[PDB]
Amino acid sequence: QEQVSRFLAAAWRAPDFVPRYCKLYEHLQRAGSELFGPRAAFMLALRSGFSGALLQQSFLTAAHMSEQFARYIDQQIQGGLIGGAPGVEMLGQLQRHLEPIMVLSGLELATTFEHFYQHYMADRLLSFGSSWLEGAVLEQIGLCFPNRLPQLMLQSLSTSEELQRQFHLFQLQRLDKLFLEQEDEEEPSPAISILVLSPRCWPVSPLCYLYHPRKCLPTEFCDALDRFSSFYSQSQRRLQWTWLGRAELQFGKQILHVSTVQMWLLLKFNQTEEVSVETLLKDSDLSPELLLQALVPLTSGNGPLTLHGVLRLHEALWLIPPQAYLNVETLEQKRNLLSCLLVRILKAHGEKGLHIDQLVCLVLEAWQCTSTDVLSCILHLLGQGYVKRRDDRPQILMYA
Amino acid sequence: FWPLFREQLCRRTCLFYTIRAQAWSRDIAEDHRRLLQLCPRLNRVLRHEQNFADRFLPDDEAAQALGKTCWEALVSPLVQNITSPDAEGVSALGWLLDQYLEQRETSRNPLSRAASFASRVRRLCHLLVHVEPPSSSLRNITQCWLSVVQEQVSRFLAAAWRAPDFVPRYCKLYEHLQRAGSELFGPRAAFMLALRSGFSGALLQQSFLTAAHMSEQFARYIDQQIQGGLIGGAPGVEMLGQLQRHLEPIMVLSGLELATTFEHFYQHYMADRLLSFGSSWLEGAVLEQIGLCFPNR
Amino acid sequence: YNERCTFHHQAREFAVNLRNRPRSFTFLNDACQGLEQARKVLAYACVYSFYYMDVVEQQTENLELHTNALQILLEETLDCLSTGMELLRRIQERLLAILQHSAQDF
Amino acid sequence: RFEVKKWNAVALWAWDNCAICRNHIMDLCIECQANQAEECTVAWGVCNHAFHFHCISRWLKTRQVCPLDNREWEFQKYGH
Amino acid sequence: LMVPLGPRLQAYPEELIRQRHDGHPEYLIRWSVLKEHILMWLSAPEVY
Ligand SMILES: [Zn+2]
Ligand SMILES: [Zn+2]
Ligand SMILES: [Zn+2]
């Protein structure tokens, strides 16, 4: 514990933090083996030492460490998928290094670790596909997440596929009914795949929405969307379309992969020879920062467009914007408020105590958050020494 | 005076409809193109009987008894007759389903003869199965589906076991037949079992050199997909999804006389992969999916 | 061509299996002899191909299918005599004709 | 010109007492409210619903899914 | 032909007993029950 705490307080800002942490874990494990022989009590001791040193830390620093872990996993996954010969070595190093990170299981950092893993998994699943890599990594470290949100994401994708099959059958049945009606009384296209998401598990932003779809996308696509919406209603929960997604475009002999914003801008470009940015903004009614991030990889090198800022023609490319990582320069305020309210309710309810699940009920009502958030605040207050568990009734929370 | 009437009416209805079933059957045996018109006749008989029941029989139990008698009297021998093989081996329903699958490709133009043919076949089959929950009708229809699938796959295998497109076309055929079975008979488990049994039978009815060639082809396809998916970039991440899809048509080898050769050839390629790159995630995932296809592990 | 080669290989395998291991017995023996002759002719035909055209191909495919079915029945078995003799004579004549065509071609 | 050859659209789907026995969320259990003298503590599950231990004990002994969201119920053991 | 009519009841025809909505006469065929006797009008295609 002393060694690892020295290291943590020594270097948590340098960008090599996760590799150095994992190398430290491996070195200490080898040393313990060389000293006391291969035993299990000592491995348990090592894990507990790492856990204690992690906990004995500040909140801003714990948040920084969580973001770093998530970012490292994401970089390794992306590189191992995209690259060639080095990618295999990277995937090997990752399937090795995943054991040090499981020390976050059950701690009070798992919630922030998961809330930061969600963003990157979302960007990955929407740019690439639901590759087997995500499933393997989750079968490995899937217990660190309290609420189990990534598994719900992966289930959402399969649910969407089943919806596609049922939609095909439904269309066939409508056609059969119409043909029967017409018979008894008498007696080169774009493939569209729709993906439905559940806002319980996906962190879609309230800025990435399409409100009036007909005013932006072409009539054919608007009609396809309308048909699927009709099916969802007649078989159901509304449907709010978003600017997320990807598309394959053909331009001469070039096959391009673009995002939805990119595809839409370029499609509008296909009926003129120059476009003005202000007109684009006025017509789109979306975030200008988003528009800039979408345009950047287009006017750059090997891009189909050119800047002059007017947009003009420049005269298997992969022009998808890379993932702009977050930077932990409100979670602290949320933890503070939850702790304050929990302490107030624990002090008011009488030293007789209360039940933890009923306590979560009280706290959620008082806020009226998440059960996991309240539980982690409770763990924080128990560690810091402000509350305790009744020896006679462990479910009874007794203020101290 | 109820049981006297119950017995007498049950007997009369059962006999009348057995006679009529044999009549329609001997009518359909002469010209095979009559099932498309067999659908509306059944609709009329069922509608009339339901009208009568609702008007003149109060107990829901009485209604259910009359209905079960009418059904098991008219639709059971009709099925056991139209799905019985001739001397050559083509039943009426077998012929209908074969023609459906053959003309399925040109049935996209929503104004053509194929569209009408497909609609009629679809409605007839849904009607014949609309009362399932092993009855004596679902069993016959299941065996008929098995026979149609087996003939199709046998034709394909004997046709193209040499071209380097063997495995992709095999998997495309699997997907085509599965979607067709679903859109014909609704999503049911007995029919998926029938599909798997038909494929397995078509595989077994083959010679030894051809079985060996097919096994080597499957192994080489798996190896090429794994190598590409690991090495390449965006094309590789695209190929791995197709690979994941295509393992179910290969799992049909789980428990045949070919699994031994398929395994003996998978060993050879796994060796070179494992001594050129490490024991990656891909080998573990592929095995966690198609593991049970190997007898000796 | 692939179908014909597969049918010839299957017929040869079935004939080898039958060789390795009472009018019905005589009919089965005659059918097996005719199938062996037809399989020899088909092997020669495939060898010549490897080193009314549509009608001839259809006739060859039909003869191969008939020989395969007869061999399969004979393996499953383990007027009629005139029909078998006529079939054997026709098979021998077809074999001789194919051999003559091969000799004329090369 | 450009030709769209594939597209992948994305759409979110958007729309609290002890629903199973319908008593008030913080109130007591109706099954045992008939037999007055109140021992059911609330139970939480990964799927983020709160139900009575009595309700859930019975229901689960009958069926093995979450009655509210169609997922295999998992007794939440985090933070415990 | 012994038409089944239940678990333990079969039927077999005996003989025409008369002749008489399609312009073509019916036949009041008598049917013997082998475990009474049923009378049934049957049309000419049906009886054939
Ligand atoms: Zn309740
Ligand atoms: Zn209760
Ligand atoms: Zn739930």
mmCIF file of C-alpha atoms and ligand atoms in Angstrom, chain D residues 47 49 66 69, ligand 3:
data_model
loop_
_atom_site.group_PDB
_atom_site.id
_atom_site.type_symbol
_atom_site.label_atom_id
_atom_site.label_comp_id
_atom_site.label_asym_id
_atom_site.label_seq_id
_atom_site.Cartn_x
_atom_site.Cartn_y
_atom_site.Cartn_z
ATOM 1 C CA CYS D 47 -32.662 -2.961 -13.572
ATOM 2 C CA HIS D 49 -36.700 -0.815 -9.821
ATOM 3 C CA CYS D 66 -38.309 -8.822 -13.897
ATOM 4 C CA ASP D 69 -38.697 -4.767 -17.915
HETATM 5 ZN ZN ZN F 3 -36.767 -4.044 -13.803
#
